[PDB]
Symmetry: C5
């Protein structure tokens, strides 16, 4: 993804206009091939009108220009763009929320699966490795960047997400369907094994572990659903036809006609259709928002950094359940033990502008 | 469903335009009968204007063409299309989310219902068979493809979802209503039987099983609600009248009049209303998005593959609770036991483009 | 409700157009009185223009027709129709989801409240009768069809939802507010009584029963909220004024003026304003979608069948907790015990069109 | 709130038009001062054009009228009205859902906090009084009607929501922030005290009590968030400027010019701009929907009856946990004990129109 | 944030118009630099048309003015403004809901972590300090105001959110990623330590503590997701190009041409484009709603007061778990113990307007 959150923290004078100078993840990277072929096909029709066509063929083409400018209905293209892109954006955000993230599991695992010995250490890592394995298996199914990192299951074994013994049981499962849910079943068998030996101390801890896994597994199942159940193809084709019919109407209907015939609204030569160019940046760019986000798991610049989230979850969950298992600093009194209230100090860059009346409710200054 | 997720992974130059060459689940499969009758009725009026009508009947028809072009309000058809299709798409996605999927149940069942013996094996399979039975019974009520696969309850018995003894108790239940919830009540009786004999070891395991079933049963109840409570018929008829009134206005109001009378905006002969054809692809295709998705359980190409999801859930849940019950690979140290951190390697097709600064927050490059 | 889900299963050639032949729950049943008075008031103005008005009064009326056609802004009526009806449809669907349905309670009750004896049988039925009683009491408050079925509380006693002893405690509660929540408090007292005598065997079962009831009771409270907190009246009046101002503008502004004065866009006589009639079917029908759904608990054809849902829930929950309490078929091996995988067979009407490659992910055909 | 749910139960012929005769909570109560000043400023400009201006000053004003009618863009005002009011309506409904309602707490308290003695009675009432106290404290912060009922905390003590001993501990808490969450902390201390003495019998009961309180406390925190975090002021000002610029354009651009100069679309005298008046009812009334609902806790007619909900919750929860604690009618057989099925009878006003085939699914009439 | 909730409590006559006099968080503070450069560039073109250009260069510029007024399509800018700002507002509200608030944790901690001694006191404060520490660490990552208050981790140690011993374990964690989740792992280690020593008395209390923390930790993870995954940059650039192309079209297309050439719709001199100025307040202000809210964690006036919420949560949670741990007022009878019902009194400013029939349901006045 292209992150510009710091650029737009405060609404400044040229704020969104300086985002028109970015190139990575931009409209210009997405549209310049389409803009050059649209403008090239415009100049080719404009040059045929000037130097190629005979005088009676120019009059017929002039009647064709006035015809197509009637059908350039720029207003209804916006609704099928507005409703469709909002659908794609809604799917795009829920696909990010369905990312297999092991943070909720790693807090349950470090709190409930016990033992400083090598066995309890191996219980905690294998539970997190199985959650990470289900993450890798569903992301190499839906994300082309994860798939180029893990083209085979042997790549998942040499990366350490799966072992060779787990590889044998994975491949010997007779199922024609995608086996991303298999380490989630291994998680339940491992947690039930840990409950039997008392490494999970109580049944509410074991229940919390299985509630947390089902939340994780249903997120993996949701990424498979979004990958399988596309935005409906008829709806993608309707918005594509509506945008391209508008631009077919524009490269004839916005041609600069010869002013000597006195056609109204056609008394000018610019030899570049600059406001049709800006309409192309608007409407074809609005469609490119959907074209970038309809599969947010490819290698667009604004697509999800799924290999980063795999490396983050695997490193952090192994960090949380192995090194950080039961090493607190000793319980020690804070700065505000002798203090009835508790307020942290401000720097000089925040003390001066803040420190203003605390909001108590709207009805109190009555 | 028609899945084109891999085609649109990266936003390419001709990306959405190559989806206009697909036929399965396309606008062209949905609209070509309507387009040929619209264009045929257009050419029939155009031929009556040329060769049939007398010269004074042509002038009256010419006044009728100018009348109907005033009422071709292409803008308000788009709002009742945009708001209605978004409602249908919202129902269509929530109907997919309400699909009876046994994955969350199969992780609880393999983790909580215990025993390698034939009895505990039979407990785990019957719990999954009862969840799958409620899935088949609600899907043959709402999906025509499941219903043609299971036309009678005897078809459900010969498919193995129900047994002959379960068939007797199913048919002897005196209820006039659909009995899809009956195996969910059998699930609760079976899980309570398994808790009594200690195959479910603790009450939090038994509670998790019943929470998971109620989530499954309410998904089955939601598919019945969507099947029963349609999109409101008055709202379907308003969008149908609005689209067809627009196209009734178009096959008169876009007729190519004789240029010798000098009617403005009517100085051309194309003998094919090509931009009215593209408007028909836009508006009637936009309605066809709703017509395909209003019942997503029929045999449209873009309808849900409900027999596939039945075969997947039954095969996977039987695979998860029978063969995969308590056969882990032995707890064995990963690649990153001697390693404080944990990073999986990259292939050459992903190492070169990735490996870029880790995002820590927007405020840190301040 | 009017259910047409089977009619629109597959998108057919005349699919939504055959729904324009339905009468029950249709636009024509909702609009024909309004259409006849609109067309009657149109013909009355058209007849006054032809035979009543003098020649100088016709010119003033002709200036009035050209005035009102300027203000027929058909575009902004659509936004206040599109945004308002979507609000009403959103409330209409959430009101259906808030229906008091006892299925989630009946699965907990049959799984947790125990005993084949007459006492445990009476515990299970009274818990379901109290849930059904809260359903009847909130639905006779919000639904006119339930209220005509239960006009008094004595009707609820003779229907068997309440007993005479429960009637005394119901009427002796000193509260000015609606007492639909009273059997939900009786449910909690009954479940706590059953936990004390061990008919509820464990505390997690008793907790699940009370979580399930609070979900049921908050659904009853939500139906009271929707009944009390209407769509805001100012917003209902704004959309009513916007639609009727448009149609006031239309029955003057679309009058067929005398062509001898040569008023432009007014050179025709149809003596029926057929495209204004179709605009009336569009806009007034779009408002009628809201008028039918703003209270979905009346006796519109497309209103909820609330007496059916009362009869279904009472019959099914009594069927689930009394006859179906702990009578499973004996645990018996399925068709797929000797089979490593598990696939159900297809009929000849589904084997031929299906059996096509299983989707594994989008990235795998790379 | 103004409740008209019974008026719109069945979609009738003059149904929404009879809601234009209501005055309480109406557009006319909200708009008549604005309509009289708009029409008064219109007539003042119209009278200056007739009797005050000289003949050359009338021509300049006539050029000003034709200028401002070009900028009366009634279409884009509707989008910033449609999107903004939908945001306000969404906040308005979620603010009603965040109302502190003690029904879910009172069902847990009567089911889990035990004892017929005066101590257990005092435990149940104090738990409900503390929930009601947090309700009063957050509603007097956000609702002007609750604040005029409880202007001081001493008013809350004389109303009985707080005691004098609780008043001392409330005032001696050193916190500059609003202390609405303080009785929720007292609830947790009281429930933990009741668990220690076994008035709460099991830990799952005590956990359910604390889950239920956190749902209640987060609803109180949500009302504080909505009160603090307004609809953004820039967005309120944009919709206010857009509506008033349109109406500034209208009281010049819709002036009836002198027909003797022959200005087109200006050949009439009405001396009342009746369709501009109806546009004012549309657009300024649409803004008044937002102006009424942006703070739904004031004393608008359509604002929430927050003092009613305080009196309802306090009376009902004291009724539920004190008098209704453990007085069931004795477990007694229903009307349908000797009956395998269970159907309640119909009155003559509902038997005749109902009793129609039970819906089983869409696929069954195949 | 700029809070005006009390100003708009009752819909008054000049209600939203008096919000056009506010300056803090206003359109005028956001737009005046853009308005002065737009009007300055307008007057510069207007002065070049009057005094600089020759008479034949004025005619070419006049043809350019009529060209650009054709492309000022004010209608489609509104849809890409309406759909985009609604997306930004939806993200802005969910970012406020994802704020790390310790109220739900502090009610569990004071109810479940026990002991009046210094050890149990230190357990309760350290659990709340660790929740507050994760709040500070994620807010200094996403909020520039928190970051200027805590520029280093040493600032977090001198503020008392972290200790020096906790600082050593924080810095010695080998992770390249943001370590905001580290005190949430410390929370789980501390709660598991407290359960082992019986300061947490039961396993359901310990489970509730870990469910509550995972809700808190996922809110911290959600703020990181929103900070990382921006509104997509192509969509921000499309709405920026659409607004600025419209205003590029306006500062030529709305130029006041010389009336002596008799250009239609151009017969006036105002020498200030006042309705183009109001359109600039509309459209550029509508974009400024998004520009203020796209990062709601900066130092805009309408941005979130994140340092206030840090100081509130830290002061209140230390107040709730230390001083308010197990000091109830003694269980004492309320005002309504001898009263069967329970109604609080009204002041004279609320008794007179209220006391009106209690709503029982819509169907009861039948
Ligand atoms: Ca992409
Ligand atoms: Ca279909
Ligand atoms: Ca109705
Ligand atoms: Ca208000
Ligand atoms: Ca900001
Ligand atoms: Cl639980």
């Amino acid at each position: 993804t292209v992150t510009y959150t710091a650029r737009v923290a405060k609404a400044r004078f040229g704020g969104f206009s300086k985002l028109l100078l970015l190139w990575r993840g931009s409209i210009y990277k997405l549209l310049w091939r389409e803009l050059l072929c649209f403008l090239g096909l415009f100049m080719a029709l404009s040059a045929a009108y000037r130097f190629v066509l005979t005088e009676e063929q120019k009059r017929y083409f002039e009647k064709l220009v006035l015809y197509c400018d009637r059908y350039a209905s720029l207003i209804p293209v916006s609704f099928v763009l507005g409703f469709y892109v909002t659908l794609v954006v809604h799917r795009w955000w829920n696909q990010y929320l369905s990312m297999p993230l092991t943070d909720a599991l790693m807090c349950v695992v470090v709190g409930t699966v016990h033992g400083h010995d090598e066995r309890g250490r191996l219980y905690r890592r294998t539970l997190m490795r199985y959650a990470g394995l289900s993450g890798v298996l569903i992301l190499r199914s839906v994300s082309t960047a994860v798939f180029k990192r893990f083209p085979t299951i042997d790549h998942v074994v040499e990366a350490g997400f799966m072992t060779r013994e787990e590889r044998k049981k994975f491949e010997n499962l007779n199922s024609s369907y995608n086996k991303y849910w298999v380490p989630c079943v291994w998680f339940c068998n491992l947690a039930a094994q840990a409950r039997r030996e008392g490494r999970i101390r109580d049944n509410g801890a074991f229940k919390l572990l299985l509630e947390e896994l089902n939340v994780f597994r249903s997120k993996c199942g949701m990424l498979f659903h979004y990958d399988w159940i596309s935005v409906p193809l008829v709806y993608t084709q309707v918005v594509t036809i509506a945008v391209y019919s508008y631009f077919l109407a524009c490269l004839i209907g916005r041609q600069f006609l010869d002013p000597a015939q006195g056609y109204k609204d056609h008394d000018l030569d610019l030899c570049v259709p600059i406001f049709t160019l800006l309409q192309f940046f608007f409407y074809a760019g609005w469609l490119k928002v959907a074209e970038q986000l309809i599969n947010p798991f490819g290698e667009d610049d604004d697509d999800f950094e799924t290999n980063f989230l795999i490396d983050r979850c695997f490193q952090v969950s192994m960090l949380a359940v192995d090194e950080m298992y039961d090493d607190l600093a000793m319980l020690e009194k804070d700065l505000y033990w002798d203090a009835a209230e508790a307020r942290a100090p401000y720097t000089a860059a925040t003390a001066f502008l803040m420190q203003q009346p605390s909001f108590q409710g709207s009805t109190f200054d009555i």
